[PDB]
Design an enzyme around this catalytic site. Sequence first.
Site, PDB file in Angstrom:
ATOM      1  N   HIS B  67      -3.259  -6.515  -2.756  1.00  0.00           N
ATOM      2  CA  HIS B  67      -3.212  -7.813  -2.096  1.00  0.00           C
ATOM      3  C   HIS B  67      -2.094  -7.842  -1.068  1.00  0.00           C
ATOM      4  O   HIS B  67      -1.317  -6.896  -0.938  1.00  0.00           O
ATOM      5  CB  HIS B  67      -3.065  -8.962  -3.099  1.00  0.00           C
ATOM      6  CG  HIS B  67      -1.774  -8.974  -3.851  1.00  0.00           C
ATOM      7  ND1 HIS B  67      -1.254  -7.858  -4.464  1.00  0.00           N
ATOM      8  CD2 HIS B  67      -0.917  -9.986  -4.122  1.00  0.00           C
ATOM      9  CE1 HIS B  67      -0.120  -8.176  -5.062  1.00  0.00           C
ATOM     10  NE2 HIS B  67       0.106  -9.464  -4.874  1.00  0.00           N
ATOM     11  N   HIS B  69       0.696  -9.507  -0.412  1.00  0.00           N
ATOM     12  CA  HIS B  69       2.098  -9.863  -0.552  1.00  0.00           C
ATOM     13  C   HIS B  69       2.977  -8.755   0.003  1.00  0.00           C
ATOM     14  O   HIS B  69       2.652  -7.574  -0.109  1.00  0.00           O
ATOM     15  CB  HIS B  69       2.444 -10.107  -2.008  1.00  0.00           C
ATOM     16  CG  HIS B  69       2.202 -11.505  -2.457  1.00  0.00           C
ATOM     17  ND1 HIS B  69       1.835 -11.813  -3.746  1.00  0.00           N
ATOM     18  CD2 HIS B  69       2.272 -12.680  -1.793  1.00  0.00           C
ATOM     19  CE1 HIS B  69       1.695 -13.119  -3.860  1.00  0.00           C
ATOM     20  NE2 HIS B  69       1.947 -13.669  -2.686  1.00  0.00           N
ATOM     21  N   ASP B  71       5.469  -7.306  -0.991  1.00  0.00           N
ATOM     22  CA  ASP B  71       5.862  -6.222  -1.871  1.00  0.00           C
ATOM     23  C   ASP B  71       4.682  -5.328  -2.219  1.00  0.00           C
ATOM     24  O   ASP B  71       4.773  -4.540  -3.159  1.00  0.00           O
ATOM     25  CB  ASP B  71       6.517  -6.747  -3.149  1.00  0.00           C
ATOM     26  CG  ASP B  71       5.645  -7.706  -3.894  1.00  0.00           C
ATOM     27  OD1 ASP B  71       5.799  -7.850  -5.123  1.00  0.00           O
ATOM     28  OD2 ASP B  71       4.810  -8.338  -3.240  1.00  0.00           O
ATOM     29  N   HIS B  72       3.563  -5.459  -1.511  1.00  0.00           N
ATOM     30  CA  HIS B  72       2.467  -4.510  -1.644  1.00  0.00           C
ATOM     31  C   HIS B  72       1.862  -4.106  -0.308  1.00  0.00           C
ATOM     32  O   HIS B  72       0.868  -3.378  -0.304  1.00  0.00           O
ATOM     33  CB  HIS B  72       1.344  -5.068  -2.533  1.00  0.00           C
ATOM     34  CG  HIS B  72       1.792  -5.558  -3.872  1.00  0.00           C
ATOM     35  ND1 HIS B  72       1.341  -5.011  -5.051  1.00  0.00           N
ATOM     36  CD2 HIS B  72       2.604  -6.582  -4.223  1.00  0.00           C
ATOM     37  CE1 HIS B  72       1.880  -5.658  -6.069  1.00  0.00           C
ATOM     38  NE2 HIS B  72       2.657  -6.614  -5.593  1.00  0.00           N
ATOM     39  N   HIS B 149      -4.729 -14.947  -7.822  1.00  0.00           N
ATOM     40  CA  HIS B 149      -3.294 -14.956  -7.543  1.00  0.00           C
ATOM     41  C   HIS B 149      -2.939 -15.094  -6.067  1.00  0.00           C
ATOM     42  O   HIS B 149      -1.878 -15.638  -5.758  1.00  0.00           O
ATOM     43  CB  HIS B 149      -2.654 -13.687  -8.118  1.00  0.00           C
ATOM     44  CG  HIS B 149      -1.372 -13.288  -7.458  1.00  0.00           C
ATOM     45  ND1 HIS B 149      -0.165 -13.870  -7.766  1.00  0.00           N
ATOM     46  CD2 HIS B 149      -1.111 -12.369  -6.502  1.00  0.00           C
ATOM     47  CE1 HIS B 149       0.787 -13.319  -7.037  1.00  0.00           C
ATOM     48  NE2 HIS B 149       0.242 -12.394  -6.269  1.00  0.00           N
ATOM     49  N   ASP B 170      -1.836  -7.479  -9.328  1.00  0.00           N
ATOM     50  CA  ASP B 170      -1.595  -8.894  -9.551  1.00  0.00           C
ATOM     51  C   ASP B 170      -2.878  -9.550 -10.025  1.00  0.00           C
ATOM     52  O   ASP B 170      -3.952  -9.272  -9.490  1.00  0.00           O
ATOM     53  CB  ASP B 170      -1.132  -9.575  -8.284  1.00  0.00           C
ATOM     54  CG  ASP B 170       0.339  -9.411  -8.041  1.00  0.00           C
ATOM     55  OD1 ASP B 170       0.911  -8.404  -8.496  1.00  0.00           O
ATOM     56  OD2 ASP B 170       0.923 -10.295  -7.382  1.00  0.00           O
ATOM     57  N   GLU B 195       0.491  -5.896 -15.113  1.00  0.00           N
ATOM     58  CA  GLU B 195       1.614  -6.668 -14.611  1.00  0.00           C
ATOM     59  C   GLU B 195       2.323  -7.320 -15.785  1.00  0.00           C
ATOM     60  O   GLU B 195       1.687  -7.698 -16.770  1.00  0.00           O
ATOM     61  CB  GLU B 195       1.153  -7.751 -13.647  1.00  0.00           C
ATOM     62  CG  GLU B 195       2.280  -8.437 -12.916  1.00  0.00           C
ATOM     63  CD  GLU B 195       1.807  -9.615 -12.103  1.00  0.00           C
ATOM     64  OE1 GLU B 195       1.135  -9.399 -11.083  1.00  0.00           O
ATOM     65  OE2 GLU B 195       2.106 -10.763 -12.487  1.00  0.00           O
ATOM     66  N   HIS B 390       5.251  -4.052 -13.286  1.00  0.00           N
ATOM     67  CA  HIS B 390       5.708  -5.089 -12.370  1.00  0.00           C
ATOM     68  C   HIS B 390       6.423  -6.136 -13.217  1.00  0.00           C
ATOM     69  O   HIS B 390       5.793  -6.790 -14.052  1.00  0.00           O
ATOM     70  CB  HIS B 390       4.503  -5.651 -11.616  1.00  0.00           C
ATOM     71  CG  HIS B 390       4.825  -6.609 -10.508  1.00  0.00           C
ATOM     72  ND1 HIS B 390       4.994  -7.958 -10.703  1.00  0.00           N
ATOM     73  CD2 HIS B 390       4.931  -6.411  -9.173  1.00  0.00           C
ATOM     74  CE1 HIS B 390       5.226  -8.546  -9.542  1.00  0.00           C
ATOM     75  NE2 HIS B 390       5.188  -7.629  -8.594  1.00  0.00           N
TER      76      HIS B 390
HETATM   77 ZN    ZN Z   1       1.358 -10.941  -5.451  1.00  0.00          ZN
HETATM   78 ZN    ZN Z   2       4.138  -8.094  -6.582  1.00  0.00          ZN
END
Ligand code: ZN
Ligand code: ZN
Lengths: 803, 424
Positions: B67, B69, B71-72, B149, B170, B195, B390
């Site tokens: 996804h 975000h 951090d990905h 999410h 996520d 996660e 995570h």
């Molecule tokens: Zn996320």
């Molecule tokens: Zn994350």
Amino acid sequence: QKQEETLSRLRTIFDIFLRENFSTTNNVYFEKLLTHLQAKENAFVLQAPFVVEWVDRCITAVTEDFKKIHPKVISFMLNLTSFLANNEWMIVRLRELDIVNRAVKLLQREHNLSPSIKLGGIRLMKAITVYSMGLAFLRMHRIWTLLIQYSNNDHTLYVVREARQVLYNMVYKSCDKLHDKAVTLEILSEIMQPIHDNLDNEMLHKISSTLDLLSYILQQTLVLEERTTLIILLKEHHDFEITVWKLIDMTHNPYFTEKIFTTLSSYNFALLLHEKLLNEEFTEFGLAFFNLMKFLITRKDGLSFVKLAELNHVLWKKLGPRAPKEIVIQQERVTFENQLICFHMLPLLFSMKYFDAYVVKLLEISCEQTLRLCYTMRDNFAGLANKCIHSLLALENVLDREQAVTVCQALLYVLREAVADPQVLHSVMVGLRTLIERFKITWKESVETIGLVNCLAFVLENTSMDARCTVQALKLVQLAVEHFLSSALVCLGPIIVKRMHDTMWEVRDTTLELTTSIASISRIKFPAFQRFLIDSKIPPIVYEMAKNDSEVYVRASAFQCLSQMVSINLLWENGLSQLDLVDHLLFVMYRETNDIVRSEAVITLMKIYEHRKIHEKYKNTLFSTLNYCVIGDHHTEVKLNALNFWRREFYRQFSNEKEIQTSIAKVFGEVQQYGYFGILLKCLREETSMEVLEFLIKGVKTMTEKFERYTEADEVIESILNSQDAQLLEKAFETKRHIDEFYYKQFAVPLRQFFEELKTIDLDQLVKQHQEWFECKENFTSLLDDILGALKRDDENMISDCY
Amino acid sequence: PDIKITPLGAGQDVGRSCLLLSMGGKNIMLDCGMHMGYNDERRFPDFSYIVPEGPITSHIDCVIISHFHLDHCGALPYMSEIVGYTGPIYMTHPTKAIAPILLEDMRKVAVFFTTQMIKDCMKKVIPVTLHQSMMVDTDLEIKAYYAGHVLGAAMFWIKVGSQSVVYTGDYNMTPDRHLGAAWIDKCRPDLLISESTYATTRCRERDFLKKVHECVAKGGKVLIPVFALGRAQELCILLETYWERMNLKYPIYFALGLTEKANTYYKMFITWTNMFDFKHIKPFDKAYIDNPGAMVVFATPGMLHAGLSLQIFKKWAPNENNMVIMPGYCVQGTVGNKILGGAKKVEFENRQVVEVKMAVEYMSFSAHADAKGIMQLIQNCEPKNVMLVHGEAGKMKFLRSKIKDEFNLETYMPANGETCVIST
Ligand SMILES: [Zn+2]
Ligand SMILES: [Zn+2]
């Protein structure tokens, strides 16, 4: 002075660390401190007498038991000791105290250290082993068996790549300092032991690990520029080739045999460098290398063959200047560099061919010892082609000038045969593109560029593959146009027009990139033969698809293309000036967000105004919109482009006794009536960015030497909360241009006010403020304040979340 | 056969999410994310772990992004242009068309990787649709399942010759308003990465509306720093519906360079979950900041990094009546962390301290999976091993005991840079 203040803060936080109870997530802080202790500017905080006392107290607090005394502070402690271990005074204070001995014993007697304590301890070992007294202690303590334990068994793989360096450093330093061979022999026997002992699937792990460690040691000796005696010790006492060739006999695996072959090859190269350096032909390496490659032939393995050839190439390039490039194998004059690449390329050519038609022309580069091995490869006969191509393109970091030409020619052949699975196609096209753009393989070097363009035209035209290959094809056509310059026109005619109408984003943007490239070629560099290719149907489709294609990058690319192909006279006279272009640019520069395209619209306007003429009725709207394009919340690129427009306009209009004085006064009057000084004031005193400030400062500075002379509410809440957002949007679904031509009148500040209001305000402080604040933003003291706040406050409900 | 996973980030941590599912003889790279803490080379995952000194990568067969975000996704241009990479990058359509916007915004905030790099990094992208088995070269079969999410998040099912892996990334197993619950068939993989952000863990929504309404009436302004997408569209339905069901007259400005994105998001929303203008929303300019009456301004970025939100916050700070409802985690170093941490003074451009007196609040909106959700997911999937990457260390340690107690499986919690060999 602030030094005592920051030292006191560090004292307080270190005193916080030692306390037996601790629970702190958010690891960042620790690493931050470590980095901020590495910088030489903080070099006084290690010289202070506080840090070594903290280290001693923590170690005497950890050595008796640390079942739970420090969760993660130990790793910081060991890294801090390693940072201390640099020799100004710390080495003898660490020596006189029981710190380093306790640290080594701590590392020895533990069993399940988490892989951050291990790396800290190994960092300490590396920092101490560079000095003589550290090596004396390490020789005393019999530490190396722990390093073998780490480099053999643990799972970290950031430890082993750090442990092996310390191991090899001890071995090399002990050998080369004229120290006793007892310790060196003991180290080497300890490394060698899992092989000598064996002369299922459990011992194979130890065998592979020790083979890989030995190969690493040999390659690090290969880097060395000085004569060492390690290789002779390895050959004499623990005779290496015979043991390894006995090891290959019983155990069988394709993945595991790559390690045995790389350690054999690395040994051969190391023996070359450390025997030929001091006691002609290179036959002793020659027969070994060629019977080794013959054994790879006979074992019938493909991937190991190309990997071994790759690594032979890498090692030979690693020898460096001390290589004659012409080996006398047996009465011959055989240049070694070519046979490595022949062995490398041959599996690719043999795989994609299926009886030889093109390799026969290649093999005259190779000599007879390679010819016999190729002729037994052919009798010796999966997805092997793309692996070979990726190996060849992994070699491209070190490949000097002519092997690049040879591999480019071979990839051209394999592409030509592939045209007449798409993975091999995509791989070869990417590799050919990167080799061409790196090594300058212009038309004199290649032979059959006509085949390149023809097969590329067929690829682009008649089969319509997935879009991941078409983009690379258009990039290749772009390289071919701008580098192989000296058929093409009728091939590039309809395919450009068809691909500009493609269903996907990724093709249309690339086609626009190719079109602006060939339009930039159509300037003075190349004759108008390309222009009439463009002049068929391209500027109308470029404009009317720059109008609306509903992808932002497409419109950006089309606008920069239309900026590039408007300053050439034939297109503008024929098919561009009829379309009212400045109207659409004026509409875009104001009533259009997503200001990646606004900047390039400004560029297109700049080209049109500079190299052409616009009607006199647009000038008021033009300058009003241009003034708006800088004042207001816009990104940096739009402001910078608009200031470039104004500077170019000012300087261009400026080149047109008393008479010169009056004309120049009229020129400033004409430029100030539309408003240029006042907008510079409003942009200088207000706009906050980095590079706009230097641009304005240098512009005003360059100008100013040529200037100064002359209940009820809860039912709705529970009603909102009891329906999904897919049901608050069904209801939501089911239920100007060309700004006024006198917007600039307010920004009409005369010259006289531009004297005073520029005289009063400071100049270098504006550019100094936003950089000095960024320098002071992440100083050491700020980090200490932040980490004190993090330690004292404990909010459990604040969770580190998905950013 | 031995499955090896060596997280280059996001193991006993959050951010830098990067897992290397080296398995079945075919290297695979999971999510490629950035860490908005560090500003050195540690910001992006360490890639010397694969090919030292080699600026081209020819080992990973495919890179899978879950996804959007940051951090990905934030390291994807760096992984594809600075360190070379030319192979496929599989990701879902909404994530595919949402990621460039966020990456461009991050580029603008951080000033290093140019828009040309952003475009070239995503000419390589291949889009994948849900429940459609698509194959990388041979015996590397990838399927994608609906996750939750965020818009366009999926969790992937990777098969290499009788060795399955389900990577969740996520997800959110509880029913919700915005997006529902993830769904999985009865595949029985030999591993299930998961996660554990909410291992220990209405009222988070009512306290938003009921607080912003009671703050706007007293003549005080309200500032809500958000990124371009994600949480900025979670709220602009609640505020608009709250001020349409109840007739209100205050303006809610919306940070001009953001409004067309609010059409793309809700265009994709109705396609994914199963022209557009707002009534009381009007974009605003720098002049409105000093106007006397109440407002509710959305702004970018979402951690008070730098830009519009910081200049708005620098002027509304000394007033007592104002408020700053940060809606998401603020990482170390942003003015957001100091403010959410009780700082009553924050430093600025030339030794100026704004004495924050405004009422800072914090409301999380992410909707991860809680403790019961993960055992529900395990009971739907029934794997052979479980892996938690995570989140934070102690929470995973607590969850491991419960997993072992209930389902008798194992559980691995690797640190950063530690291979976790899993057998059969
Ligand atoms: Zn996320
Ligand atoms: Zn994350």
